[PDB]
Write a protein that binds this ligand. Structure first.
Ligand SMILES: *[C@@H]1O[C@H](CO)[C@@H](O)[C@H](O)[C@H]1NC(C)=O
Lengths: 48, 48
């Protein structure tokens, strides 16, 4: 998220065994980090 | 025709005001983006 000029990240890590989909059942993401960057954002791009 | 610079030539014999000084200007901007340099926050011993 990018709100009131801060960019925030939340994240979670889980080992799984479902062959080609997103899992059933519940988990919540703890906050990872917060960045006071003050930049506009409209698009994004993954890296392999 | 003039070269737009002129040199110093600081010698240890020069008088006060005519000697070399090292100078800093401290400058800052306010409220245009989120506050990201600030003074240290003093603290007191914990009471229970
Ligand atoms: C952010 O981008 C939008 C879309 O181009 C623009 O309307 C807005 O003025 C921009 N804001 C800043 C602070 O760059």
């Amino acid at each position: 998220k990018n709100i009131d000029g801060y960019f925030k990240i939340y994240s979670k890590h889980t080992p799984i065994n479902l062959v080609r989909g997103l899992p059933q059942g519940f988990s919540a993401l703890e906050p990872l980090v917060d960045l006071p960057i003050g930049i506009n954002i409209t698009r994004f791009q993954t890296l392999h | 025709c003039y070269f737009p610079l002129q040199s110093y030539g600081f010698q240890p014999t020069y008088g006060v005001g005519y000697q070399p000084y090292r100078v800093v200007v401290l400058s800052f901007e306010l409220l245009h983006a989120p506050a990201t340099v600030c003074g240290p926050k003093k603290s007191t011993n914990l009471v229970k």
